[PDB]
Structures are given as structure tokens and as C-alpha cells.
Amino acid sequence: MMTYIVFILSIIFVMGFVGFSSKPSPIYGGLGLIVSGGVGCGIVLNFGGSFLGLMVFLIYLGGMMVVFGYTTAMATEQYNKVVLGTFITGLLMEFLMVYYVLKDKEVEIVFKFNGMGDWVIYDTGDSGFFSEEAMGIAALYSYGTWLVIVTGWSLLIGVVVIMEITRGN
Amino acid sequence: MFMINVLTLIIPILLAVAFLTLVERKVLGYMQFRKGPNVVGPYGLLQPIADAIKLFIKEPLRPATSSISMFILAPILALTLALTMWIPLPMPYPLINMNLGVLFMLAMSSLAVYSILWSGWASNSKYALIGALRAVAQTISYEVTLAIILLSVLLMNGSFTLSTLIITQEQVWLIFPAWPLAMMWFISTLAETNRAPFDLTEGEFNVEYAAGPFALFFMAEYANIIMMNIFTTTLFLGAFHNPYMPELYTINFTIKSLLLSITFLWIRASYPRFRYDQLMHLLWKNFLPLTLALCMWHVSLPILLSSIPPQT
Amino acid sequence: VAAFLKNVWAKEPVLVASFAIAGLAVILPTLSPYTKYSLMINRATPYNYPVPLRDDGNMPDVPSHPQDPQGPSLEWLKRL
Amino acid sequence: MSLVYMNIMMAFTVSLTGLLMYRSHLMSSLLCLEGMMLSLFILATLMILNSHFTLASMMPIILLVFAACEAALGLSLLVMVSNTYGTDYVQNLNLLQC
Amino acid sequence: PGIVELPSLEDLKVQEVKVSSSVLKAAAHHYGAQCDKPNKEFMLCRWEEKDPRRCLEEGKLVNQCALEFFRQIKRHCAEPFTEYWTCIDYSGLQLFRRCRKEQAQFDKCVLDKLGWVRPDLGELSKVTKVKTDRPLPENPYHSRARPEPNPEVEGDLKPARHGSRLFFWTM
Amino acid sequence: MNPIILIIILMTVMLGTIIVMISTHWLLIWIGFEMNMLAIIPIMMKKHNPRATEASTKYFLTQSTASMLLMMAIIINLMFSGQWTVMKLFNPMASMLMTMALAMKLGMAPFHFWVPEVTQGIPLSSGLILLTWQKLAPMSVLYQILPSINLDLILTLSILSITIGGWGGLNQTQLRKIMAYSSIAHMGWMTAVLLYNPTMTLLNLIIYIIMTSTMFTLFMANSTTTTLSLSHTWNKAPIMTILVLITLLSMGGLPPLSGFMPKWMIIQEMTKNDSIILPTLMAITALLNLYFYMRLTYSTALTMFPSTNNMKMKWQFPTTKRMTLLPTMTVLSTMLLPLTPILSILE
Amino acid sequence: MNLMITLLTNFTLATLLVTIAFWLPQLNVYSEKTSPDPMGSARLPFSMKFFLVAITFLLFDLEIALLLPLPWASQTTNLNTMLTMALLLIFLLAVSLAYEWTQKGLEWTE
Amino acid sequence: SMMRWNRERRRLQIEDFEARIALMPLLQAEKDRRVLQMLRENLEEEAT
Numbered sequence A: 001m002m003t004y005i006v007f008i009l010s011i012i013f014v015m016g017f018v019g020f021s022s023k024p025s026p027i028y029g030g031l032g033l034i035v036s037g038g039v040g041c042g043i044v045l046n047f048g049g050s051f052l053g054l055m056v057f058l059i060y061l062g063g064m065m066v067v068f069g070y071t072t073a074m075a076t077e078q079y080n081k082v083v084l085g086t087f088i089t090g091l092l093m094e095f096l097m098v099y100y101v102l103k104d105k106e107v108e109i110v111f112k113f114n115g116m117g118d119w120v121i122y123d124t125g126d127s128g129f130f131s132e133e134a135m136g137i138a139a140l141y142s143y144g145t146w147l148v149i150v151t152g153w154s155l156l157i158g159v160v161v162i163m164e165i166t167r168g169n
Numbered sequence B: 001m002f003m004i005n006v007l008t009l010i011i012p013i014l015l016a017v018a019f020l021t022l023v024e025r026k027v028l029g030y031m032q033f034r035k036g037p038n039v040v041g042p043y044g045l046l047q048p049i050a051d052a053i054k055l056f057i058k059e060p061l062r063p064a065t066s067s068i069s070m071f072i073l074a075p076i077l078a079l080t081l082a083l084t085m086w087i088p089l090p091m092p093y094p095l096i097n098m099n100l101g102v103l104f105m106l107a108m109s110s111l112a113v114y115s116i117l118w119s120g121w122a123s124n125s126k127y128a129l130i131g132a133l134r135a136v137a138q139t140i141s142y143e144v145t146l147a148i149i150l151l152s153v154l155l156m157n158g159s160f161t162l163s164t165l166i167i168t169q170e171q172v173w174l175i176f177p178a179w180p181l182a183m184m185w186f187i188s189t190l191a192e193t194n195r196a197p198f199d200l201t202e203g204e205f206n207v208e209y210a211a212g213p214f215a216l217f218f219m220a221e222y223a224n225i226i227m228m229n230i231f232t233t234t235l236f237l238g239a240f241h242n243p244y245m246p247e248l249y250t251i252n253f254t255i256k257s258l259l260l261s262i263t264f265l266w267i268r269a270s271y272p273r274f275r276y277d278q279l280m281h282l283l284w285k286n287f288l289p290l291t292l293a294l295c296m297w298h299v300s301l302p303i304l305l306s307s308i309p310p311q312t
Numbered sequence C: 001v002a003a004f005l006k007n008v009w010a011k012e013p014v015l016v017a018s019f020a021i022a023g024l025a026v027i028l029p030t031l032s033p034y035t036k037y038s039l040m041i042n043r044a045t046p047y048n049y050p051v052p053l054r055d056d057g058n059m060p061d062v063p064s065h066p067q068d069p070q071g072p073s074l075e076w077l078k079r080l
Numbered sequence D: 001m002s003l004v005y006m007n008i009m010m011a012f013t014v015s016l017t018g019l020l021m022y023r024s025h026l027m028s029s030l031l032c033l034e035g036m037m038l039s040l041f042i043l044a045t046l047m048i049l050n051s052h053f054t055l056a057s058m059m060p061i062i063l064l065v066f067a068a069c070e071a072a073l074g075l076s077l078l079v080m081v082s083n084t085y086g087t088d089y090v091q092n093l094n095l096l097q098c
Numbered sequence E: 001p002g003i004v005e006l007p008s009l010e011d012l013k014v015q016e017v018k019v020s021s022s023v024l025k026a027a028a029h030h031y032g033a034q035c036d037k038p039n040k041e042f043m044l045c046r047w048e049e050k051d052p053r054r055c056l057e058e059g060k061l062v063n064q065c066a067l068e069f070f071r072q073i074k075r076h077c078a079e080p081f082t083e084y085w086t087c088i089d090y091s092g093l094q095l096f097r098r099c100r101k102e103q104a105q106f107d108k109c110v111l112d113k114l115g116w117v118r119p120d121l122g123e124l125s126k127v128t129k130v131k132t133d134r135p136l137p138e139n140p141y142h143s144r145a146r147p148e149p150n151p152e153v154e155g156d157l158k159p160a161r162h163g164s165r166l167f168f169w170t171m
Numbered sequence F: 001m002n003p004i005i006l007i008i009i010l011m012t013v014m015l016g017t018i019i020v021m022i023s024t025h026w027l028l029i030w031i032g033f034e035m036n037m038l039a040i041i042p043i044m045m046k047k048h049n050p051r052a053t054e055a056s057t058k059y060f061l062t063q064s065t066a067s068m069l070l071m072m073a074i075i076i077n078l079m080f081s082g083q084w085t086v087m088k089l090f091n092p093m094a095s096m097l098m099t100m101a102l103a104m105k106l107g108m109a110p111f112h113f114w115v116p117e118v119t120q121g122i123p124l125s126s127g128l129i130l131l132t133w134q135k136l137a138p139m140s141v142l143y144q145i146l147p148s149i150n151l152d153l154i155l156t157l158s159i160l161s162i163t164i165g166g167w168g169g170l171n172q173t174q175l176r177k178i179m180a181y182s183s184i185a186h187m188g189w190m191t192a193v194l195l196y197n198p199t200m201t202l203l204n205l206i207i208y209i210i211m212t213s214t215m216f217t218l219f220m221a222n223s224t225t226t227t228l229s230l231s232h233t234w235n236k237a238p239i240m241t242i243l244v245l246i247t248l249l250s251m252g253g254l255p256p257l258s259g260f261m262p263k264w265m266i267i268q269e270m271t272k273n274d275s276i277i278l279p280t281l282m283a284i285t286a287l288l289n290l291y292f293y294m295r296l297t298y299s300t301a302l303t304m305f306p307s308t309n310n311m312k313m314k315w316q317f318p319t320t321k322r323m324t325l326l327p328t329m330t331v332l333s334t335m336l337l338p339l340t341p342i343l344s345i346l347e
Numbered sequence G: 001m002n003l004m005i006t007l008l009t010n011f012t013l014a015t016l017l018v019t020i021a022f023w024l025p026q027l028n029v030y031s032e033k034t035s036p037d038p039m040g041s042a043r044l045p046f047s048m049k050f051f052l053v054a055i056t057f058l059l060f061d062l063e064i065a066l067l068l069p070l071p072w073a074s075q076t077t078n079l080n081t082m083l084t085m086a087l088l089l090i091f092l093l094a095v096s097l098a099y100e101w102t103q104k105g106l107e108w109t110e
Numbered sequence H: 001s002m003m004r005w006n007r008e009r010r011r012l013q014i015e016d017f018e019a020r021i022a023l024m025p026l027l028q029a030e031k032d033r034r035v036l037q038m039l040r041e042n043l044e045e046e047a048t
């Protein structure tokens, strides 16, 4: 049970997407995507990506879904069958996938997937006095020069484009 | 045994928040040439207990909520994020010693605006929603300088580890190389917690909550106030740590954090409120340009002095 | 260049301090003599293992023991 | 392959079909689009952390930033729609049939 | 494919260095100075063979040379060493900087009774050279023969015969 | 719009397309498409009316969906190949998803459903950019992934694009939708010869860009967006009727004009590969495109529709519009077939 | 594991306090209240300026996300390139702020 | 003050890293015998 925990989080992750892909309301959709971002962050944390998971909190949830809920709260003036039907449809599809891959230890929807817990695929060594993920992100400034140029230029152009298309003139 | 440690974290947080209300009313009393509460308890010490018993037996205000679920979740999220901002705080040892405690705190404080936003939309008042949008925009505005000032200071630390930030400040307080970052940090954390002179929620969002849940929002806000003062203390006024006697560090950072919380109480009894555009002007046109300039200075400065801190 | 600078320091001192601190941050690492020592300390921090070489017969400058005289020295780092 | 990749891909396809079957709102569409981006973040992250390919650890951050900027653009588009009709309904966007 | 060949359990039996990490870190610099040679033989064997099964006996020499390092501490300087690794052992990050007088007593006692000198800052990270008698691996990756490349272009470049030959274009 | 900001935004569009063309990493391909979309959005909203905002919303939704499918194809490529080279794809699922994503970016059928909408909603210059410059980067990626493109998929997309872009323009009186359905048909023509000889793909792309730029430049010179407004040209500018005549007779693939050049060469590279049914059906379906080109030439050049009285005022003002490269493009889009073996410069 | 226990404990304490706040004064049998705002019933007017400060937050927070690996990036061996790209990112954040200034984007929430 | 103390901290970091480097041959030999032990145990249990 605890050796399958990432898998269990991933199941919640799929459930969370059916929490908003059925689209109940964009505010309940925002709440479902927040819970989905939290559990997917936990999945990232359990392979050792602490910095990437805290980017999911700080930038995806605390940065961007804040703006989604903010913009949504400035619309949809405050006060379904298809929503609940599609929700239970996606839920039953996902639990049939769970039941198949747990009774067969093998499944094939589009790709073949193993049924054991995903702890098996890990590495058995140490990385010394660094996180390899942290040093690969620190490499953005020495090795990642062209990437920083094009990303900063796209963000500057993004500021310019947002100011152009919202002015109305 | 770890559960006992979690309880000895979270219950004294609630007690210190309970008596911070008394310290606020007393310190604002004596700064206003009057007294604070001194009748209900001996030297007023039973005033928060009386007030908590008063609020929990007051009639529920019974609003017509837009969403019941978010009306329940906004105090839950506010209290949960108010309590989880304490677990990486090194005093001198944190509850959860993690490699990225600074970034964890910045993330869990970035998540705090959803409580304001959900409480504003879950009320049926459009006025409460406008106030919630103003408070959310204010908080997410000052989180920008929180992140950049915090990054610029941690360029002298070497890591996002909060426990390394005590080792960083064993020869000098970090306010001496970084007092402009310190003063903009201090005003920005004053603007995070909707605290005066940045309290436009009291100047003419959770007004539809009953006395119980409004008291829970209030105590989550004061837990954030005590926590950000402790985080500012660890971040700029790092105390001496003897590893064989940790209580020296604990007494020292407690005295400094109490002085800094009294400094919040001393700011709120000294200044009038900003207008909303005036603190937007304060962020985007005063704090953020100096914050970016000092971020360039604290990037280029350990390289030009050969003072790059260690990674580990 | 003189009246303009006093005018912008009288009206907008936050922006003058901003551009002054940013200008020092740009130009001063190119003029500092201690910028080289940052490079020399960061390349002297041994994150990995110093994987030794097979002594083929002609390596006069590679030591056989860490306490041998030949090899890279960090007396500049101790002394400074 | 690994079992968590099944769930992250199936989450991407769930948010795909949510983004490919609108109900009424453009905001719910953008929510499904950013769910797709989130699932791509998780999946690229689990690959790069799996294989210990160090230099690609900066890759999903980039995949965040651009696409989050993309989201900002879409939100502004939605606002211009909501500055014409009063709602963000996708059935009001049919002036280009003729 | 083939069967992987693992060594037997008799090949893995060795007198294990059963000391704690603070005992290792307290005795680390003198271990890196005094147990240099079979350690570097082993690590050169380990980065050249790229296979731990080919590096076992050298590792035994490591596990032989480490123990003679500690017995020679235990025969002469067990008390200042114990006082030093206890103070190293107290710390959570195991700081050397908290434990300088115990290090001074241990280094004084080792320099007197055993003549060992602690390595200066920058020495144990030097890239050294190892004189071995084992042969260099001619194929440490077990790589097969690479495919032969495509033939190059060569010779002088004559013009196109009768132009482009596109249906009727004479040039 | 500020002209400096317009120059920076057009350079950012060109920069994103160049970053797609010159990069060897898949993340930089995705970054080039993101930069290209993010910069082309204000070019569509230049005149600020609800049709431009609706068109930009539809364009954003389709290109965002295509970019997400592109990044999913890239991520599955990293699964099954462990690396990031912009080359062949090491999974047919990633190959299918990337071919779908690029088909959505090009507007190939049945993902064509945004091209006649958005081109109608935006000005003629932004539609010129959308139908000429925005075809460059996905065709570059399709040029570089063709050892893994499934044959039946690309040929299905090609014939479906040719047939749907042929039957689209027969019902159209709006010129921008005519150019949009012409775009869908010609992109089907480009991707049909893709796996056989991509040099003819490049030749078809260059000749199509020349002819489309000629037609949009004539539309901007005459300020006409409908067939019935284009019919007023003979009473105002009689030379422009001759120019739209020869350019629309070129775009239908009529010899001796240059627009006969690509499709003939496409047939010339498909009968070598023993495909005889498919270029025959494609050539017969191109007669639909030529039919509505002939409809436009009948309305504009070969007859004289009645004009109004106010046209007599416009006789007294010459064209002050910068008709950039219009003689050069008009000559190149008509009289280039005797230089047909020049195509070897694209090899 | 200790962190998951801590998060579960904090969520459980918060939910317990919220349940006591929403259900202890419900047991009061006070009275039924008959017939339980500056705007009466008008719709919420959309403010363009609130959306502008939110998107400006989002874009500058993305630039912050680029700036966040700098305490690790100062440890590199390619320090001239690192210093150039760090000053270039903070400079592009400042150029974003200056363009937000001079095209009247920071107005009435300055 | 931060110049002097971060330089001292870099020297202390290099000292700790060379303590690690002096320990890495023994830890590598024990790690090799550890994984070969576990693989031989898995091999014999697979055979039975």
C-alpha cells in the first residue's frame, strides 16, 4: 500500500482532472485543478524533484491558478446531468484501468504498462553533495544561454502583447 | 514522539496568537495615552479567553452563501497554511528540516490568497467580492518583492536551507550587508498580512462569516504575523547558536521576534492608511525598481568580492 | 549632465538610486581584482572524485601522493 | 513501462477531451488547456528525474514559463470576449460563419 | 541473451570496517594520506574496468588497508581519537569547525606517536598517478565492431551531361 | 499600434519561425512555435473589432491545442528515445501526434476548420502573414521528421485537404475565405509529395507563397475584400485587372504559367513511385480551385460589372499605397515556367 | 513521512476548529430570523485595471521563476557567462517594468 | 564581514569535501560488495 503511494497519488491526479474536464463551473474547475496540481506536485516530490514541485506550488498554483480564479471571480455572476454523468464515466474508466492493472500486473491501453509499483525503476546510488535536479536547474545560466535569451525575450514580448491586446486601441 | 513535537509546535502557536491580541490591545492602549484591558483578568490576562468564549457562543450570522464548499474551505485553507508556515522555521532546529524551506515558505504563502478569494466569492455581496479582489491583488503584488528580496538575500546564504541561514550570520547580522532589502522586506511583509498602513479591509471581505469562522480567519492572520516576524528575525537578525545549549538561540530569537511583532503593533498606531493606488504606487514604482537594482547588486557582488557562499 | 542629474535626484530619488546601484552592479565586476578569485575558488571546490591516471612512465607533473609537492596548490586560498 | 506514466498520460487525454469537448465557457476550456500543460510538466519531470538526465531538469521550468505566459495571453483574449458580450460563452463567438 | 556471471558468496567475505560515519569522517584526512596507494589502485581499477566484479580483490586490499589504519590508531592514540570522533559525532552536519581542540589533540598525538601529517587544504582532491601491473582494458564497454561508413565523394567534378535532362530543357 | 512596437513584434514572429528553422533541439522547436503564436496575436487584433478578437481567440485555441500535442509527441519521443534531436521520431504514437499537431498548425483538413474563419476576421496584411509566413515552420518540421511520418496518414490529410479546400471556395464570395480554402488545397498538394520528394514540397511552398503574396498585395492595393468590390477595379485601375487575371490563371495551374510548375513536378515525382491514381485524382480535384479562380477573373477582368457614381471622384487620386514587390511578385508568379529546372537550388 | 503526518495533523486541527466554529453555536435555539450592501442588485462591473495588475503579476512571477536558481547558479565554473545571463534576466525584468510604466500600464493602480 | 566569513565557509566546504573524497574508496568497495551480495542472493533464490 505504501510502496504504491505515487501510483495512489497518480490515481487521485487522474480523478482530479475528471474534477474539471467534465467542466462543472470554472470556479469548481479551478478548485479541481488546484487539488490536481497539489497531488501532481507530490508525485514530482517523490522522485526527488523538490525544486520542480515547489515551482508547481509557487508558479503554477500560487502564481497562475491565482490569476485564473481571480479572472473567473470577475466573471460568472454569483448565484448538472452531463457533468455528473461524464464525471462518473471518467471515474469508472480509471477504476477499470486500476482493477485491470492490479489483477494482471500488465495492461495495454495504447502502450504497455507494468502493474508493479513504480518504486522498482529507481536508481541505487547517491549523488554526493548535490541534487542532480538542482544542479541541472543551476545549469540554466552557464550552459543554457540561448534558452535564457529566447525565454526572456518571449516574456518581454508577452508583456508587450498583453499591453497591446488589452488596450483596445 | 514526533506527534508530541507537532503538538508542541501547533498548540503554543495558538496560545501565542491568543495572547498577541491582548498584547496588541495593551500596546495600542499605552501608545494612545490610555490603558489596554486590565479588568477582565489580572493585568488583562483573561481577556482573550473571555473573548473566545464570547465568540463561540454568539449566534451564527447565517449567510446565503454562493458556494457552501468554498465557504467552508476558506477558513480551513487559511488555518492550514497559517500552521504549515512554521514547520521549516529553524529555532534552532525546525520541525521539518528540509533543503528548500525558504522556497517552501514562499510557496505556502503564495497559496494564502485563495482563502481571501474563496471567502470573497463565497459571499453573495458584490462589495465583499470587490474588497477580496483588492486584497488579493495587493497580496500578490507584494509577493513579487518578497520573492526577489528573498532571492537577493539568499545569494549570501548559498542555498534555500533555512538552517544554513543561521550559519550565514554567525559573524554579523545579515541586515548589515542588506538593510535596504531588510526595510523593503519589512514593509512588504507588513503589506502581506493586510496590516496597517496597508489594511484596506478595515478602511472605507470575510464579513459574511459568523463569529467562529471570522475568529479563525483572525487567528490565522495573527499566526501569519508572528510567523513572518520570526522569519524576518531568522532572515536578517540571526542569533548566536551554541549547539550544546540551543535555548540560547531560542531565547534570543524569541526576544527579537517579540520586538518585531511589537514593531508591527507600533507601526499600526502611528500612520494613516494608504489609498489603494498609493500602495500600488509604492510597490510598482518604488519598491520593485530598487528591488531589481539590489538584486543585480547582490548577484554581481559576491563575484566581485570573491564572497560566494558555499552550496552545502 | 549636471543640472539634469540634480533635477532627477530632487524629483525622483528612488529611480536615481535604482539606476546607480544597477550601473555599479554592471560595471564593477569588470573592474574588481577579486573577480578572478571567485572563478578560482569555484573551480577548486571538489564535488567529484579526482579519478587518478595510469602512470604510463612520463608524467613529471602529476603526483603519486596528495602530499607530494607537484600538483595544484591552494596556498593562495589559505593565505589570501 | 512504469505504471505512473499510464496515469499521467491518461490525465493528459482526460484534459484533452475536456479541452476538445466544450460545454459553454471559454474559462473552463483554458482550465482544461492548463491541465494538459500540468500533465506534460509532471510527465516530462518524471522522465527527466528517472533517467538522471541532468541538463533537462531546466526543461520543465521552461515548459512552465512559456506556457504560463501562453495562459496569460488566453486570459486576455477571454477578457476581450467578455468586453463584448458580457459572458465568456463560446456560442457568442459565431460572427465568422459568414 | 546470455547468463550474467556473479561471484560466489565466498568471494565477497571480508573483514568489514564496522565503524560509524563520524569515526570515518574524524579519521578521514589521515586515512586519505596514509591509505593512499591501494585506494587509488582500486579507484583507477574501478573507473577503468567499469565493472565491480573485476575490482573485488583490490577492494579487499582497501578493506585490508583501512583496518591497519584503525588498529594503528587503537594501539597508540585511542583516547584522543575517541574524544575527537565523539565531538564530531555530536553535530548534526558533523562539523569540523566545532571540534578544533579535539582535532588538535588527535593530530598532536598522531604526529608524535605515528609521525603522520594531516593533508593541507587542496591536497586530497589532487589528481594523482597510479603505477599498476594490471593491463589496460582494450574494450571496457564490451563494444562490438562499428558499421563501416558510407563511401566518400572524391575526384574532379565534371559538369552535368547534356544539362539538367528535365524533359526538354537543353540546359 | 506604435510602429516601433510593430517592428519588434514582426521581428519576433520572424524570430520564432527562424528558431524553428535553425534549431536541433525539440524544446527550441516548441519555443519557436510558442514565440510565433505569442507574437502574431497582436497582428490579428490590429484594428480592434470583435471579428479580430474572435479570430484571435479561435487561432489561440487551435494553435495552443497543437502546441500541447506537439509537446506530448516530444515527451513520448524522450520516453522511447532518451534524447532530443530534431530528426526522425522513435515511436509511431509520437509520429502520429506530431503529424496531427503540425496538421493543426497548417490548417490541413479535417483540422482546416479555423482557416476560413480567422482569415475572414483579420486584416489583409495579417492574413497574408497567416497564409504565407505561418506555413514555413510546420513545413520545416515536417521536412525534418519525414523518415517517421506514416504514409497513409499524410496522404489522407493531403487528399482530404485538397478535396475540402476545393469544395470550400466554390460557395465563397469573400476573398479572404477564397484564399483560405486555396491555402488548404495547396497545403494538401505540398504534403502529398512530402514523403516522395521534399524538394518538390519546397518548390510548391515557394511558388504558393509568391502567388499568395501577389494576390494579397493586389487585394491591399485595390482595398477589396469581396468579389463584388474587386469587380470595381476596371473602372479605377485597369492594369490591376490584368494582374489579378494572370495571377489567378497562374494559381489554377494553367500552363504556360508558373503555377503549373509545382503540381506538374509533384506528378513528376509521384508517377516515379508508381502512384498513378493519387496524382490523377489530385489533378482532377484542382479543377475546382481553378473554377472559382475563373469565377473571380470573370467578375474582375474578363467582364465589366457596373460601378457607381462616386468612382468618378477616385479617378482624381493616384494610388499612394506602398505596393511592395508587386511588379516583382507579379512577374515571378506568372513567367517562371521556362525556368522550371531552377528547382535544383532547393535540393 | 514526517511531513505528510505534519500536513495531515494541521489539516485535521483546522477542520476540527472549523467544525466547532460551524456547529457549536448551531445548538443555540435562539430565534428564527425574519428576512435575513452599497450596490443593490446591479451586476459586478468588470475592472480592466484589476485584470491588468493580475497579468502583470503573472508575467513578473514567471520572470521570478527564471530568477529562482541563482543561489545555485553562483556556484558554477562559467561565471562570466552566468553573471552576464543573470544581469540580463534582471535587466529584462526591469525593461518589462519600464515598458509597463511608459505605456501607461501602471495607472490608477500605479 | 560576509567576505571574510563566506571565504572561510568555502574553505570549510573544501575540507568536508576532501573528507568525503578520502572516504569514497572504502564506501565504493563496500557498495560493490553490497550490490554483488544482493544480486547473488536474488540469483540463488531465483534458482530455487
Ligand SMILES: CCCCCCCCCCCCCCCCCC(=O)OC[C@H](COP(=O)([O-])OC[C@H](O)COP(=O)([O-])OC[C@H](COC(=O)CCCCCCCCCCCCCCCCC)OC(=O)CCCCCCCCCCCCCCCCC)OC(=O)CCCCCCCCCCCCCCCCC
Binding pocket: E168, E169, E170, E171, F256, F257, F337, F338, F339
Ligand atoms: C562573342 C561573345 C558573345 C556571344 C553571343 C552569342 C549569342 C548571340 C545572340 C545574342 C542573343 C542570344 C539570345 C539567347 C540565345 C538563343 C535562345 C533561344 O532562342 O532559344 C531557343 C529555344 C529552344 O530552341 P532550340 O532550337 O532548341 O535552340 C536554339 C539555340 O541553340 C538556343 O540555345 P540553347 O540551346 O543554349 O538554349 C538553352 C535553352 C533552350 O530551350 C530549351 O531547352 C527549351 C525550353 C525553353 C523554355 C520553354 C518554356 C515553355 C513554357 C513557357 C512558355 C513561355 C512563353 C512563350 C512566349 C510568350 C511571349 C513572350 O533555353 C532556355 O532554357 C531558356 C528559356 C527560354 C528563353 C530563351 C531566350 C530568350 C532571350 C530573350 C528574352 C525575351 C523574351 C523571349 C520569350 C520569353 C519566353 C521564352 O526556343 C524556344 O524555347 C522557343 C521560345 C522562344 C525563344 C526565345 C527567342 C530569343 C529571341 C527573342 C527575340 C524577340 C523578342 C520579342 C519581344 C519580347 C517578347 C514579346
Ligand SMILES: CCCCCCCCCCCCCCCCCC(=O)OC[C@H](COP(=O)([O-])OCC[N+](C)(C)C)OC(=O)CCCCCCCCCCCCCCCCC
Binding pocket: B175, B180, B182, B183, B184, B186, B187, B197, B232, B236, B267, B271, B282, B285, B286, B287, B290, C011, C012, C013, C014, C016, C017, C020, C021
Ligand atoms: C528588519 C527590521 C526593520 C527594517 C527597517 C524598517 C523599520 C522602519 C519602519 C518605519 C515605518 C514605515 C511605515 C510604512 C511606510 C511606507 C511608505 C514608505 O516608506 O515608502 C517608501 C518610499 C516611497 O517614496 P516616497 O513616496 O516617500 O517618495 C515620493 C516618491 N515619488 C516621487 C515616486 C512619488 O521610499 C522608498 O521606496 C525607499 C525604499 C528603501 C530605499 C533604500 C535605499 C538604500 C540606499 C541605496 C544607495 C543610495 C545612494 C546612491 C548610490 C550610492 C552608491 C555608493
Ligand SMILES: CCCCCCCCCCCCCCCCCC(=O)OC[C@H](COP(=O)(O)OCCN)OC(=O)CCCCCCCCCCCCCCCCC
Binding pocket: B015, B041, B042, B045, B046, B049
Ligand atoms: C504557557 C502558559 C500559559 C498561561 C495562560 C494563562 C495566563 C493567566 C493564568 C491565570 C492567572 C490568574 C487568573 C485568576 C482569575 C480570577 C480568579 C478569581 O478570583 O475568581 C473568583 C471567582 C469567584 O470566587 P468566590 O469564591 O466567589 O470569591 C469570593 C471571595 N470571598 O471564582 C472563579 O471565577 C472560579 C475559579 C476560576 C479559576 C480560573 C483560573 C484561570 C484559568 C485560565 C486558563 C489557563 C490556566 C493556566 C495554564 C498555564 C499553567 C498550567
Ligand SMILES: CCCCCCCCCCCCCCCCCC(=O)OC[C@H](COP(=O)(O)OCCN)OC(=O)CCCCCCCCCCCCCCCCC
Binding pocket: A034, A035, A037, A038, A039, A041, A042, A043, A045, A046, A050, A053, A054, B073, B076, B077, B080, B081, B084, B097, B098, B099, B100, B101, B104, B111, G001, G003, G004, G007, G011
Ligand atoms: C482544497 C483542498 C484542501 C485545501 C487545504 C489543504 C491543502 C493546502 C495546504 C497544504 C499544502 C501541502 C503542500 C505539500 C507539499 C509541500 C512541498 C514539500 O513537500 O516540500 C518539502 C520537501 C522538499 O525539501 P527537501 O529537503 O528537498 O526534501 C527532503 C529530502 N531532502 O519535500 C519533502 O519533504 C517531500 C516529502 C514526501 C512527499 C510529500 C507529499 C505530500 C502529499 C502531496 C501533496 C499534499 C497536498 C495536496 C493538495 C494541495 C492543494 C493546494
Ligand SMILES: CCCCCCCCCCCCCCCCCC(=O)OC[C@H](COP(=O)(O)OCCN)OC(=O)CCCCCCCCCCCCCCCCC
Binding pocket: B288, B289, B290, B292, B293, C008, C012, C015, C016, C017, C018, C019, C020, C021, C022, C023, C024, C026, G091, G094, G095, G097, G098, G101, G102
Ligand atoms: C545602465 C544601468 C542599468 C539600467 C537598467 C536597470 C535598471 C534597474 C532599476 C529598474 C528601473 C525600472 C523602471 C524604470 C522606469 C524609467 C522611466 C520613468 O520612470 O520615467 C518617468 C520618470 C518621471 O516620473 P513621472 O512619470 O513623473 O512619475 C509620476 C510621479 N511623479 O522619469 C525619471 O525619473 C527619469 C528617469 C531617467 C533618468 C535616470 C538617471 C539616473 C542616473 C543615475 C546615475 C548614473 C547611473 C549609471 C547608469 C545610467 C543609465 C541611464
Ligand SMILES: CCCCCCCCCCCCCCCCCC(=O)OC[C@H](COP(=O)(O)OCCN)OC(=O)CCCCCCCCCCCCCCCCC
Binding pocket: F010, F123, F125, F126, F128, F129, F132, F133, F136, F202, F205, F206, F209, F210, F213, F217, F220, F322, F323, F324, F325, F329
Ligand atoms: C524554403 C522557404 C524558406 C523561406 C523563404 C521566404 C519566405 C517569405 C515569406 C513572405 C511572407 C510575407 C508576409 C507579409 C509581409 C511581412 C510584413 C507585413 O506585415 O507587411 C504588410 C504591411 C502591413 O501594413 P499595414 O499598415 O498593416 O497595412 C494595412 C493597410 N492600411 O504592409 C503592407 O500592407 C504594404 C502592402 C504591400 C506588402 C507586400 C509584402 C510582400 C511580402 C512577400 C514577398 C514575396 C516573398 C519573398 C520572395 C519569395 C520567397 C519564397
Ligand SMILES: CCCCCCCCCCC1=C(C)C(=O)C(OC)=C(OC)C1=O
Binding pocket: B014, B018, B021, B022, B047, B048, B051, B052, B055, B214, B215, B216, B218, B219
Ligand atoms: C480556541 C482558540 C481561539 C479561537 C479564536 C478566538 C480568540 C481570538 C480572536 C478573537 C478576537 C479578539 C481577541 C480581538 O481582540 C478582536 O478585536 C481586535 C477580534 O475581532 C477582530 C477577534 O476576533
